[PDB]
């Protein structure tokens, strides 16, 4: 009833390559909360071209 220490330790190539539909859909609270330095630094062409007003 124990684990065979010499069993297959590799990764089964014929495993599940799709996405798990029941996986975590929530937002991860302890994720990256800082800004990204290599984000988009250029102005947006399709931004607001009018007044506030």
């Amino acid at each position: 009833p124990n684990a065979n220490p010499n069993a297959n330790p590799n990764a089964n190539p014929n495993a599940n390559p799709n996405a798990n539909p029941n996986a975590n859909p929530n937002a991860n609270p302890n994720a990256n909360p800082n800004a990204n330095p290599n984000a988009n630094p250029n102005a947006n062409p399709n931004a607001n071209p009018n007044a506030n007003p």
Partner: antibody
Amino acid sequence: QVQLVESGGGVVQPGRSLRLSCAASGFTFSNFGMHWIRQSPGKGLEWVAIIWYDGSNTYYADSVKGRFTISRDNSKNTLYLQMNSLRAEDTAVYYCAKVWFGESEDNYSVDVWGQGTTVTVSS
Amino acid sequence: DIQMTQSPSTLSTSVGDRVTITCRASQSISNWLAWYQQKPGKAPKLLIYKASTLESGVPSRFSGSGSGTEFTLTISSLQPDDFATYYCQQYSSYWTFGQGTKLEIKR
């Protein structure tokens, strides 16, 4: 506490379209995935659709795939379901539901259900 | 598509009784099973997830058991607020609900 309010249901002729909405309050709506689940006397409880917190992944039941479209507006804290090409068997009470918070590798389902809105497809 | 089946469909019981309802899946769903309670004309409420974890706020007289393909929900001592319909739901592969068991007041 958590509160979900459905609206938009009513009587619709077969073949027409209908848009259901679900207003969420009492929690950070943009942080949670949502389900739409319907209930009819003939089929019982029946899952319809699921959407990720950011809308990146959506899934649909096989009986509705290609006809229903689930979306969300996180700026308005509103969940939407656009239903096209309605058939008679789609008459049911539709609930929106909130996914519970869990561990990163667990499977997920819903913990809080909305009030429910009735949709009647009849000519 | 995993089929779910609940037994019995209707159970006549009395206040104070020990109630046990069963739920079976067409294939192995591990422990990813939830139990929902629904009162008539009202929205369903979550009772148990992972087949045996009690939802916060649920009284301790509710308990879950089971693994693989057979699962049971047990109410140790029935109280009048517990007369409702109970649905099981696998969430191992998409989401499918059982037909539901309605607890009826025996007289």
